[PDB]
Amino acid sequence: GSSGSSGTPHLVNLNEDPLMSECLLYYIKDGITRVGQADAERRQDIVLSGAHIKEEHCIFRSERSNSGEVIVTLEPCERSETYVNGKRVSQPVQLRSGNRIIMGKNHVFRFNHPEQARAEREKTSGPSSG
Template sequence: MSGGSVEVQEAGRALKVHTETPHLVSLGGGRLSTAVTLHPLPEGRTTIGSSPGADIVVQGTGVEPVHCHIDNQGSLVTLVPVSDMTSVDNLRVNHPTRLTQGCMLCVGRSNYLRFNHPAEARMIKSVLPNSRISVLPIGFFPDDGGGGLVEGKPPTVPRRSWDSWEGLSSASNEEIARYISPKVFPAGSSTVNSPAALVLGPRAG
């Protein structure tokens, strides 16, 4: 494989394929695909598309001849979308977006590629105690000043200031009483913990 060496190890009945360079793992774009393909991402720009001249050729519904680019600059890997049908972790992206270890790219309608960054994975394992995480915490990677490199991140919920809670202290007792849960019973009332005869009343006849 150009762009980096590949090490294949036997693990029981399985085979482990390992490379030190950032790469994409393609599972194909349909049920009839039976191969697992590793695409290296060397320093510089890698083009993904359906054109025979693309660095990574992907066929399928919604895949453009030049669909997107991936820039690897000093181990910082950035997805530069060209087509609208490009997503990262099920979030559609339309600006340059930084790729992080384990994220899933979708090119076109159904072509999925997993991004692996071995050096980044080792760094994450050394910092986070739980190595079986599925999503990195928001803000784990600081902003690199790339201007939109994290376009695919979900928005955060704004926090309310303490001043906005001042009006609650002026509520009257009548207003507060309307929000008391019906499951809160006054002292001495009959509840489900009381004898059935007391709750249901005397049996007729």
């Protein structure tokens, strides 16, 4: 269907729960997006189910680098179960397009970065990377 022409960094629900009555995805705004529970001292932009989650599980920071590109960094905790690109994540690292971010037990999320993925082409072409 048609949700929002705009792209922006948003998380998609790819969990193994196709029956999930919750939202399918979540658009990330500009600033700090705390990922925890609906009870957390502060209002978390995104809330997860289950008990394997923590009030301050992790966070999502979205800021346009000095260069002028929108970047996202995951700020996990020391007492939370978070995994990125398959591995674990305890330090503030930048997320990639298509990386698997899990929060808790079975709470996966696909980071969609169309805003940048659109310029992927414009980027240098002559040279080759890998």
